[PDB]
Amino acid sequence: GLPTMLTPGSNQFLTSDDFQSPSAMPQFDVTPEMAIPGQVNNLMEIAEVDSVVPVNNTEGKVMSIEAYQIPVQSNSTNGSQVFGFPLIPGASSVLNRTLLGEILNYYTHWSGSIKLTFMFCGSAMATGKFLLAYSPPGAGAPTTRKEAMLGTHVIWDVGLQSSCVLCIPWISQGGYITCWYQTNIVVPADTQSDCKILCFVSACNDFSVRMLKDTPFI
Amino acid sequence: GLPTMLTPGSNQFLTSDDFQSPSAMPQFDVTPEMAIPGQVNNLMEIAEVDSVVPVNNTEGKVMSIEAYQIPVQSNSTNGSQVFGFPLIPGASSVLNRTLLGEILNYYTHWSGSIKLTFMFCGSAMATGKFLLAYSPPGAGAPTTRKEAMLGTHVIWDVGLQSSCVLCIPWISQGGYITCWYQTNIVVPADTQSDCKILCFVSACNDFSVRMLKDTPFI
Amino acid sequence: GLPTMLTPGSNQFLTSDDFQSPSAMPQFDVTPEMAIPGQVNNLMEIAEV
Amino acid sequence: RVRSITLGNSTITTQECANVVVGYGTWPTYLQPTQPDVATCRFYTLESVMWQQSSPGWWWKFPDALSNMGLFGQNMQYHYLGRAGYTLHVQCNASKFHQGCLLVVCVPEAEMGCATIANKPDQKSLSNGETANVFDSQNTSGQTAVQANVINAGMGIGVGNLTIFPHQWINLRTNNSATIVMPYVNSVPMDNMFRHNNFTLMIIPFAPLSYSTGATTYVPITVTVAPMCAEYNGLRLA
Amino acid sequence: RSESTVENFLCRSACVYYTTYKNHDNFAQWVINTRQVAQLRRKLEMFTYARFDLELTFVITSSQPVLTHQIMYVPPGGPVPTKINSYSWQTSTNPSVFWTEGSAPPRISIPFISIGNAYSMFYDGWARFDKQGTYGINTLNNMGTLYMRHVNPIVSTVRIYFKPKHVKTWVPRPPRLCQYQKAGNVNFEPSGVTEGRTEITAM
Amino acid sequence: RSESTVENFLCRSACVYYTTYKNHDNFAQWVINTRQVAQLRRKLEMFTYARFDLELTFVITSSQPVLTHQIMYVPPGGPVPTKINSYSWQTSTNPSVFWTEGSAPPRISIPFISIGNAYSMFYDGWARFDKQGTYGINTLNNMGTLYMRHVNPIVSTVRIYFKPKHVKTWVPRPPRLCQYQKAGNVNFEPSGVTEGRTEITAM
């Protein structure tokens, strides 16, 4: 026959290799594909879907649907903080179980921008303002409404917009989000309960991941 | 020589593989083919041939040719059932040993339509009607002639047609066939015995099979 | 299969050889190069300083 | 501004500005002879449910939810094999003095867990036909009961991630309705409608209902369903 | 985004089964199942339907002249061994490999083999509506079974390495929150959505 | 209809012979015969005439330095061993393979070798009309014989795997109803056509 030499690496099984192998049943005619709605080609297609963020994940709230409901006290102290959190999708307890957070926990390294949507769920006739502020990585977090106001922010008037959307320029494997009570919430009538805010998160732009790992959630 | 690596799967015998092998007698000149009538290229060519169905396979009839002979009592009660059976080619004792039934017992899964032919073997001068009814899968079986009449059927007047052919739209790895005495059998003379019906079965259309298995008949 | 013969030199490791080998992580997308000042292509570039 | 939609012998009213969600971007289409049936393409309105400040949520399994519904329900029994898509219209009746927010989501193959780990849930606990099942706020306990604690959507997932499935939000502040178009989704082109539920409709509050004093204490939620492109196995000779 | 594709996420080897058998009921078996390993199961369950081919590699070792082992694959519906000398070990429709120690590990490829157009990860239905114990069983997911024996006192150990190939998936689902309880169902202990914090505010 | 072709129906491996021999009349033999296995025999007997090439693979194991085995094929009409040291083991017209333990199993291919234009499954005639005991024997179906020995106290076991290739068949026949009694004939115990039922009507 044809002269050959076996080289190092011969007769060994690399669990990560890619070689052809014989078919156990070569005579079997395999069932044809049919279109099925919802084909997924990439996991980023999932990471880009908004999911509800458990911002109010405090003891006693984590076991309920209430974890997702940020309370708004209509008669709270003016200038007080409504809510806030460390902006870290792969570590913070607020973001690491969201659809985005789950996908990123399969990778050692990742980066991109994220989108945060805040939705007000008070009555139709409720009005008032919130200050949504962003603190760049390493800047710490505002301690007062004025400090937050002097940084980068948006004034969210719920009487005009039921929701407000932020896109963080940088999210990587930190920064902060805070919301302050610029005004109280003004209503036409005396209600039974408070108002809630829901928060949603998704990938904003082309988001990248690099090396696959076991999820830390088993 | 040429550098090579042996991969997993090397030096093992897969009973289902397909590799070239050396000829034990390479110097032997093999006898040429001659045409022989009857070449078979596919088993469906056999499945499509009508064979006689042992419809009257009751105890004491199975060991005789009588298993194939459906009796017709010329003076039976009007509206009574003549015969009937579960329409399952790969399970029913009526159909699973026919040429079609035998071939399909070599496959785990199969589907297609089947053809049933009913032939009346009374005297030339015998006349009368039968109701051949088909009950779709899951519909159960008619209990009366009227019930059968209100479903899908054909009225078979033996005085015009010595045979009648049905093609079942669906046969797969159930439905029923029944035949009712719409009328009695009218004859010109007093005969010694009853009349018989023979039943035949074959594949009707393109019939499909998928995975080969051991026959259950050894 | 295709008839072959193994020749002398088969199944041995020469520390100075040059053969292809399988990648342990073929699915990993390797970080692109960026220009870095000072690329050295030859040691004579140092000997001449 | 207001649109009148008539199917068969039934009419409903929707708003012209209402949005429509088409699940997976796919509209229902038509697909061993098979027979189509358009006689069932009418609106079937389910008994409404009342949304209270403490309601945990509701669900329906679809092939089963319509099993007693006239002709659609009959075709499920006369034919053994079939397929259909659906349009689901969900609407709330609320004033401008009411607040709250619902997630209206349709979940394919929504296999649900049992309250007892060693067992499987019974058929009635999984579906009560046209009658809605109710999610719990607490852990469910029983031997054949569905684990209905809403936090896990009865599936062992976080409820906030149900947005991956075709859905629409109803924020009473901005909208009182949702429309979802659900294409047929399965591993096979046609199936037995009594042995499998293609999808489950879930309505889950994320912001509790509340209102000004003197306002009605509850909000009715109505679910109206219109089958499309229904097909069943033929029942005749070849 | 190359590492995010479905093929790179799922087309990776895993050890799915570990077993021992002796050469003196002395045979091993494994029903091919994608719910045996929590990490494999959790990734596949992010989809509702899937199609893939299966690559199976066998790492076989033994301890106390040339040992030969037989690995048999029984397709869905094929004859099954009950005994070391059952006739089913010789069925021509049950492919097998004969391998001896000292060579590269055995490897075989099993194509997509369901009669449905996809394997289903979830099934909101019953194999039979008359039996409530069949909830969640989709018979279209039968991938066949493996049987292992010595050809002719020693102990053998087998590790089965599984790798999906040419993977296509449909209808994404939320990742499971709860820990798995059993391979035959989706039962769970109700669980909170995340880890807690001490207050809703930053710092 | 791919699985229904003649080649897919018949071109599948089967174990057709199992035997043992020792290294201390101590040799094994097998006359190539397609009537030894009931499942192979029943499929081939659905035809009256056939042509095929034969692929033979040998799985050889042994128990108590390097053992070498000789597998010899004797074509129809060739010299036959009667003894372990018979001269026939060295005939140049009787091809043989020399194999040692630890390598891949031996495999050889034997072409269609009848002088007729097909092998016959059935023969309504006599090899010689003067001898009634020859009914059913078609001498044109001689496929040759295999002989097996050690080259130079141990016991060897041989499994012979048979696979028809490039199979052509003619004149289809009904499948046998009765169980097989002997390999050298078509004798049967009269049997009923099917399983019985309690009545001719449905339900």
Author numbering:
A (entry chain C), B (entry chain C): 1 to 173, 187 to 231
C (entry chain C): 1 to 49
D (entry chain B): 12 to 42, 52 to 258
E (entry chain A), F (entry chain A): 59 to 82, 87 to 126, 137 to 224, 230 to 280
Reproduce, without paraphrasing, sentences from the article in which this PDB structure was first reported:
Enteroviruses are nonenveloped positive single-stranded (ss) RNA viruses and are major causative agents of waterborne diseases. Coxsackievirus B5 (CVB5) is a genotype of the Enterovirus genus, which is frequently detected in clinical and wastewater surveillance. Here, we employed a reverse genetic system for CVB5 and assessed how different amino acid substitutions in capsid proteins affects the virus’ sensitivity to free chlorine and heat. To elucidate the mechanism behind reduced heat sensitivity of the CVB5F.cas.genogroupB mutant, we subjected it to analysis by cryoEM.
We applied a combination of 2D and 3D classification steps in cryoSPARC package to separate the particles corresponding to mature virions (F), intermediate-altered state (A), and empty viral capsids (E). These conformational states are commonly resolved in cryoEM analyses of enteroviruses, with A and E corresponding to the expanded viral particles with or without the internal viral components (nonstructural proteins and genetic material). The resulting EM density maps were at 3.6, 2.7, and 2.6 Å global resolution for the capsid-corresponding part of particles F, A, and E, respectively, thus allowing building of atomic models of each state. The two amino acid substitutions causing the largest perturbation in relative heat sensitivity, VP1.D276E, and VP1.T279A, are located at the C-terminus of VP1. These two residues interact with each other and contribute to the external part of the VP1:VP3 interface, both through direct contact and indirectly by stabilization of the local loop region comprising residues VP1.E272-T282. Consistently, this region in VP1 undergoes partial restructuring in intermediate-altered (A) and empty particle (E) states, with alanine at VP1.279 facing toward the hydrophobic pocket in VP3 assembled by residues VP3.P86, VP3.A141 and VP3.Y189. Although the C-terminus of VP1 is flexible in different enterovirus structures, the resulting conformation in A and E particles of CVB5F.cas.genogroupB is distinct from the previously published reconstruction of CVB5-A and E particles having the original VP1.D276/VP1.T279 pairing, supporting that VP1.D276E and VP1.T279A mutations may affect the assembly and local dynamics of the VP1:VP3 interface. Several other areas in particle A and E states of CVB5F.cas.genogroupB also exhibit different conformations and/or greater flexibility compared with corresponding CVB5 structures from the PDB. Most prominent changes were in the N-terminal region of VP1 (VP1.Q49-S60), VP2 (VP2.L42-Q52), and VP3 (I168–V181). Altogether, based on structural analysis of the CVB5F.cas.genogroupB we propose that mutations conferring greater tolerance to thermal inactivation by perturbing local molecular interactions which may lead to improved stability of infectious virions (F) and altered conformations of uncoating intermediates (e.g., particles A and E).
